[PDB]
């Protein structure tokens, strides 16, 4: 703490901002492709079921 | 997250607390000037006995 | 008292300053997280209830 080298608080703030960015990316992907499950990466089982259907 | 934690641990291990160093710097500068003046007063000791001859 | 070796007042001021910096860190956490109970360290009980719910 109170040092000119490490800055752990910026690291925690960056982790939080990256989580918010991942959430916004997933939501814009839903908005763009129109599906809550657009690929096997989203959820493999229901995706394969929808493909066979 | 693990790399961030390891960097925070290195910083906890070796970083210094600069705010304490500021007060230490001020006090040691004053102490050094006081020690130089004390050494000069110690150097002046031999002058007195020339007057008594 | 009145010495070149120690300075208790800077120690006490540093303690109060570290307390203020810790409060700033917790405020930045609640700001970038959006939650007043973002982890088990903040409070285990309501956080555990929120996870299960």
Curated annotation (Swiss-Prot), chains A, C:
Domain of life: Bacteria
Cellular localisation: Secreted; Bacterial flagellum
Disulfide feature: none
Biological function: Flagellin is the subunit protein which polymerizes to form the filaments of bacterial flagella.
Subunit structure: In C.crescentus, the flagellar filament is composed of multiple flagellins of 29 kDa; 27 kDa and 25 kDa.
Family: Belongs to the bacterial flagellin family.
Protein name according to UniProt: Flagellin FljM
Organism name: Caulobacter vibrioides (strain ATCC 19089 / CIP 103742 / CB 15) (Caulobacter crescentus)
Highest classification ranks of the organism: Bacteria, Pseudomonadati, Pseudomonadota, Alphaproteobacteria, Caulobacterales
